[PDB]
Amino acid sequence: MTTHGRATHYSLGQGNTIANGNCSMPAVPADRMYVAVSSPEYSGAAACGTFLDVTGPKGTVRVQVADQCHGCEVGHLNLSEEAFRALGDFNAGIIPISYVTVRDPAGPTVAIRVKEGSSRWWAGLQVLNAGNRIDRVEIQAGRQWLPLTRTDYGYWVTPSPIQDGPLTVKVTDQYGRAVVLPGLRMAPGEIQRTASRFYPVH
Ligand SMILES: OC[C@H]1O[C@@H](O[C@H]2[C@H](O)[C@@H](O)[C@H](O[C@H]3[C@H](O)[C@@H](O)[C@H](O[C@H]4[C@H](O)[C@@H](O)[C@H](O[C@H]5[C@H](O)[C@@H](O)[C@H](O[C@H]6[C@H](O)[C@@H](O)[C@H](O)O[C@@H]6CO)O[C@@H]5CO)O[C@@H]4CO)O[C@@H]3CO)O[C@@H]2CO)[C@H](O)[C@@H](O)[C@@H]1O
CATH class of the missing domain: 2.40.40.10 (RlpA-like domain)
Structure with a gap:
């Protein structure tokens, strides 16, 4: 409005x-x-x-x-x-x-930035180029999804430890549209590009 x-x-x-x-x-x-x-x-x-x-x-x-x-x-x-x-x-x-x-809005593909100081005991994720508001960010824990907490500084943080290896992250925007980002690395400070979009390029 x-x-x-x-x-x-x-x-x-x-x-x-x-x-x-x-x-x-x-x-x-x-x-x-x-x-x-x-x-x-x-x-x-x-x-x-x-x-x-x-x-x-x-x-x-x-x-x-x-x-x-x-x-x-x-x-x-x-x-x-x-x-x-x-x-x-x-x-x-x-x-x-x-x-x-x-x-x-028209923009580039979704990118994920793991925050500095992030480990398996605690991690912070920043979602970039989503286009709109994000309601949900989850990290795959086994076969379930561990919901992250939205901070007031633009990141999403773990409320509990996560498994080792590559990260599988599901991000859901305000319109109920969700993308799944596999193979995300525990690399603090790095902007990890993806080929995923919440809405196609026209
Ligand atoms: O940009 C302008 C705005 O800035 C805002 O300020 C921000 C600031 O920019 C930002 O950098 C800051 O982010 C910090 C987070 O707030 C803070 O929570 C985070 O702390 C992490 C820490 O990085 C991480 O290393 C730590 O991991 C711990 C873990 O907690 C602990 O459980 C674990 O212990 C285990 C042992 O390692 C293990 O051997 C044993 O077996 O088990 C233990 C557990 O049982 O150890 C690890 C470390 O190895 O976790 C903490 C969080 O708990 O650090 C971030 C920075 O790196 O946030 C600021 C906002 O709050 C301004 O506020 C705003 O006004 C400006 O506009």
Whole structure:
């Protein structure tokens, strides 16, 4: 649904290659089109990875939800400086906006990043390029599926130890669509590409 609100500007800088913004992006977007949302809209990092089409005075740009703006109220987006300048005048400081969460945006294949410090005793998984909100991330334990806990920093963590060897991970989005990612390695910090998609390329 269309949310009507306002926008201020801030920056995540050049960032690092580990964690950028509250969603813990592996990198600050090269196009510098990102946004921090209010705490209720952040929804415990459930909005991480999703994209917003934000309509401003000078048009409409697409930005990736990347961070949590604790000081922002509902409807108040904290845009990147580049996204702000493209929508309105930078000297204005505040601009009137309206935005929607993009449903199934065109993007690359799903990628999984195992967090630093992850072992068989404890592991954190980050799902990338899913396109939409993710409701469920599970690791295969024998013939059953061990559900992971959604953290408020963009990762999914194990509530209990997992088996050794390659990981078989099932990810389910907000639309009930699920993909299974076999052969995932316990490699902390690495972005593991896949050939899986929640929706086809057209
Ligand atoms: O990006 C901007 C935002 O940043 C947020 O801050 C984040 C931060 O970026 C992020 O890095 C951080 O992530 C940390 C997790 O929160 C934390 O839980 C995690 O701790 C792990 C640890 O990495 C892991 O090594 C450890 O494994 C233990 C295991 O627990 C223990 O059971 C096991 O013991 C077994 C023995 O090894 C075994 O011999 C014996 O037989 O059995 C034992 C068990 O019975 O030992 C292993 C180690 O070998 O587990 C812990 C968790 O329990 O570390 C992460 C970092 O690496 O999270 C931050 C958020 O909380 C800001 O908060 C936000 O404001 C910014 O916007």
